[model samples]
Target chain A: TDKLWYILQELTSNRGDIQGCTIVTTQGLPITSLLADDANVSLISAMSAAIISVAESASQELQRGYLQRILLEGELGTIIISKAGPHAILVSLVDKDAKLGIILMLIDKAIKQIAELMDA
Target chain B: TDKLWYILQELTSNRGDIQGCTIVTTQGLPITSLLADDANVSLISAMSAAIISVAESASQELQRGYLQRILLEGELGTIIISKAGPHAILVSLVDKDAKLGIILMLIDKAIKQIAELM
Candidate 1:
């Protein structure tokens, strides 16, 4: 648990734009986080699962194969959620105007590390 | 019905990247669309609502004010869904590698036109 929080902290800090990082259960429960003060951590935990749940079904039903990432863009910032492991997901927040491709690349690496670590 | 279809057709054809355009009810029912061959329009309707439903709650729950857009990225393509009006949403499809900023600008314009039209 401590190690997971470390990964979350390290990832968001390494990226200048990211302000929130959380690892939540697939069922929408907060496990660990380095969240922005303004970010409602509990809501992030709950919402990420709901988004992924429907997206999982939505993808298969649409014949899109599988869900990869869910990106929520709002007036305030961007929230990107991806599956970290069977039981967990990684959600991060960045400024709305931040370069997404660069952030996605960083997230891709972070997700794998988190996923592999969680497996242990 | 026909008028909304025209707007949808013109919008997708106006740009070569967009292959599907649909207006779905907030309840997850199909209203109108100019869909791709592989697109199951029925599922698009249902899925868009589910995505929007959670997003709407997710946004308000986080106190983000309102839901603006829901973007789903997969291996094959990208799906962007937004509120077109009180009762409907606009969902569109483009290639996975399509330039999103350019597409987003077009979608922003199209969404307004759709909301007003619907």
Candidate 2:
């Protein structure tokens, strides 16, 4: 539990690009997080799961193949949700102007580490 | 009907950027579209609305404000979903290499026109 907490913490540690992050269950529960202010663990997890479910169905219907990740861009921030393992998803929010390419790379690294820890 | 059809057509008109587009109802039905190959109108609409609904709820919870749009970047293409009006959602699929800043501007214009037409 501490390791997962630490991992989520380090993602937001000294990081202005990634304001916060949460590792959520596929069924919509926050396992561990370093979430931004005003964010609810339950809400974030549920939303991520719902969006992912719809996205995968949509992707399959459009013949776009498998579901990968989702990016929700608003005026204030950017929300990135990607599968960390078979049962978990990684959600990270960043500033609108944040350099995404660099931030995504870090997220991917964290995801891989999480999968190794959680699913392995 | 032609007006709505033409509106969808114009979004992809001579633009190598936006591959196809669809105007969907809030209830997840395709009102009109200029869809890409292998795309199902109903599927696209339903998916867009579902994603939008979840995004909105998440937005309100995080206090990130309303969700203006959704961008799903896949290996083959990018999917952009934006609200055209209170009752309509616009879904556009584009090349991964497409210039989003420019495409988004065009999309906004198309949305405005569609809002007026529909």
Candidate 3:
């Protein structure tokens, strides 16, 4: 389990110093993180919990609902959450000028690779 | 340009206390920004390009198709982007403790105002 987290962390960590990125279970547990040092850790955990809630709510009807970005006023920035696999999600807080396309591209690539490795 | 920018500012500077938020053109220029001074500016720049890039991509796939919104969920919260009009896209960040319904409601209201202004 820890090994998987390290692998996931390696996959997510980049040279950009991107903040508040994580790999959550399809059920929304934070398996890995690159969260900012000063960020509210508890708040981060709660949001992860919310991801699971939203995912479950959406999965009940449509197996496919992609919130490339979400606006929860009380939350961070745009919550770009995608359920790329049956047991995995890619969650990020992209800012106004961040390369949303590249991020999505990287995300799509990661999802494909992860799916192949996990056999999801 | 200044007048339009101010108009956007007035419309988005509402009661939400939203952080790292802004409005942009269909082409992805910042029409208005409520971003935090402490936040990294260059980082936000590239991300916006990505938004326009993807918009054009999916837009090519289907016209007037709705993204509903985007979800760039950082460990802290989520980034929300939506094209409420042909000429405008609304972007904002929501924290973990935030209420999605309420935030979206506020954005929806703001969209109506800006749309009318345009």
Candidate 4:
């Protein structure tokens, strides 16, 4: 629990631009989150799961290798989803003006930590 | 009629790595195809439409602006889908080794032609 909380904190605090973050099961269940009280973790989880599932299947159908991430860029911001261990996923929403390359690097780093924690 | 075929032909023949291409209505009905006889045009059209439709709604829901394109990269090949005019969409399958940047440019050019003909 502490490990999960620490990683979430590290992700949000280290990057002031990160709007929110969540860790969810592959089935779309929210495990933990650092989102605002008004934010809907349930919807986020479901959408994240659906997006990854679709991307994964599409990758296979298209003969693409293992899916690494699904990045959805929006007018207001960006949503990123990536595998966190075998059973879980990591999701993050960043500011519209956030530097994508740098934010992606940070998200990748966080995903490794989250994956390890999940496995543990 | 001839124009649509010509555009599809231009996209496939000019790109040595392009495997196949199809033009489908937004409703997922195949208008014409340059795919192999054995290729599943119906399924391809349905999937392409679904992808673009989902991507479009997802973009709006997330406030991402208009959906420009959807690219699914894979081991064997990549699937690229883009809107061609209001009534139709263009989908293409290209080799894994193909240069994405060049392919996109080619697809964009072809999309304009397809849009005009549509």
Candidate 5:
């Protein structure tokens, strides 16, 4: 638990623009989250699960290899979701003006760390 | 009916890599489809709607702009979903080898045509 928390803390605190982050199961169960107190854990988990579920199926249907990430950009910020591994997903929200290239690099590193933790 | 059929036909017939296409309401109701007979219309629509609904909410939460296109790629093919104004969504399945740039252009044109038709 501490390890997961630490990884999440690093992701959120490393950048000034990262709003929050969460790790959820493929089935939409929240494993751990670093979101605000007002955030809806269940809703976020469900949505994240739905997103990966839809994305994975679509990937298979299209034969485009594996799904790497799902990015949803809005007026306020951007939600970046990626496959953490077979069992989990990593979801992060970054500010609208955040440097996406750098943020993705950081997320990739965090996902690798989280996936290892989950597998261990 | 014929017009929708024609549009669906155009999408598939225009490209060898296009597997199928469908139009569904935001609520996931199937308006029309030109997919393979074995394809699951109900499931596809429901899933598409669920994806768009979640994406829309997430976009709003993140303050991203309006929902654009959703692309899911795999070894076999690709599924592209985009909003058609407020009422409908367009879902297209294309082969892995399909020319995405051209296919997207065709899809954009089709979206405009469908928007007017609807």
Candidate 6:
């Protein structure tokens, strides 16, 4: 679907300049990428694990909303992530002081875009 | 136990009335009452059934504390409800507007009283 199109538009539009954004299916396929180099594999793994824990703990309560700010830290930056929907998640690369508002904006805009694309 | 005694007290203390408050074992059985008619066999059974349904659905999301309000309105009046703990549920009735917050306060007070009483 055009889900990838929504993600790409969000990544490219970031004023802070998006480092990367990718959608990994629950089946472990890399659907699309806005970044040229596919680095951050380790970062993605850790972020995904954090989201899984939140999903397990809060899924019953969440019955329907998304989870936010699953974090993993490193020397150069931080990997902040969230689940886009039950089937997919979003991962991003930002430095220590990454503007949280921007990250939230990017993810939210992307999620709606993805949902709309899927509906289409 | 202080808790059971506490549940009894709140069940007795309401202004417009005193209905019933009981802590049944999770497995089965019943507790305290002011209205001497234990014959509402169907009423208590139905009320218990409703509370169990709410408990199962609420257990996961509620991290701490008892449930505040669970209403089961009827043609006669309404059963304004809440839980005292995992093992106990409270049931009462009032006219439609039913001073909801007072009932909520009553439940809050009762749960603490039960905890203290037990």
Candidate 1 CAPRI level: medium
Better of 5 and 6 by TM-score: 5
TM-score, structure 2 vs. true: 0.77
| All candidates: CA RMSD (Å) | 2.7, 3.4, 16.0, 4.1, 5.2, 13.8
Q: Write the per-residue lDDT of candidate 6 for residues A12-54, one digit (tens) a residue.
A: 5664645666666554455555544646554454434543453
Q: Tell me the lDDT of model 2 at A57.
A: 72
TM-score of 5: 0.62
Best by DockQ: 1
What does candidate 2's lDDT look like per residue over A51-99, in tens digits?
7887777766676666667888776887889888787889998887887
The residue pairs found clashing in candidate 6 are B2-B117, B2-B118, B3-B117, B3-B118
| DockQ category of candidate 3 | incorrect
Residue B54's lDDT in candidate 6: 41
Candidate 2 clash pair list: none
Compose the digit string of candidate 3's lDDT tens values, residues A6-117. 5446545642523455666654466666666665544454454464454333322221234333322111233455554566655555543355546666666666655555
Cα error of candidate 6 at position B63, Å: 34
| Per-residue accuracy of model 6 over B55-93 as CA lDDT, tens digit each | 333322222123344443332344444555556555554
First chain TM-score, candidate 1: 0.92
lDDT per residue for candidate 2 within B38-97, as digits (tens), equals 767777788888878877776656556678778776657778888777778899988878
Model 1: CA > 4 A from native: A37-39, B1-3, B14-16, B37-39
Ranking by lDDT: 1, 2, 4, 5, 3, 6
lDDT of 4 by residue, A48-101 (tens): 787777777766765457666665655567677778778788888877678666
Model 4 quality (TM-score): 0.69
Query: Model 5 over residues B1-118: C-alpha lDDT tens digits?
Result: 5787688898778888888899999999999999889888888888778778877875655445677666665545677787877888988988877887788778888888888888
Q: What is the TM-score of each candidate against the true structure?
A: 0.83, 0.77, 0.44, 0.69, 0.62, 0.39
Give Cα distance to truth, residue A18, candidate 2, Å. Answer: 2.8
For each candidate in the order shown, give its overall lDDT on alpha carbons: 0.81, 0.80, 0.52, 0.79, 0.79, 0.49
lDDT of residue A82 for candidate 4: 78
User: Mind giving the per-residue lDDT tens digits that candidate 3 earns over B1-118?
Assistant: 4544554455445544355567777665666666667764344534544554553443323221344454454444556666656677666655655655566667777677667666
Q: For residue A19, give model 6's deviation from the true position in Å.
A: 1.9
lDDT of candidate 1?
0.81
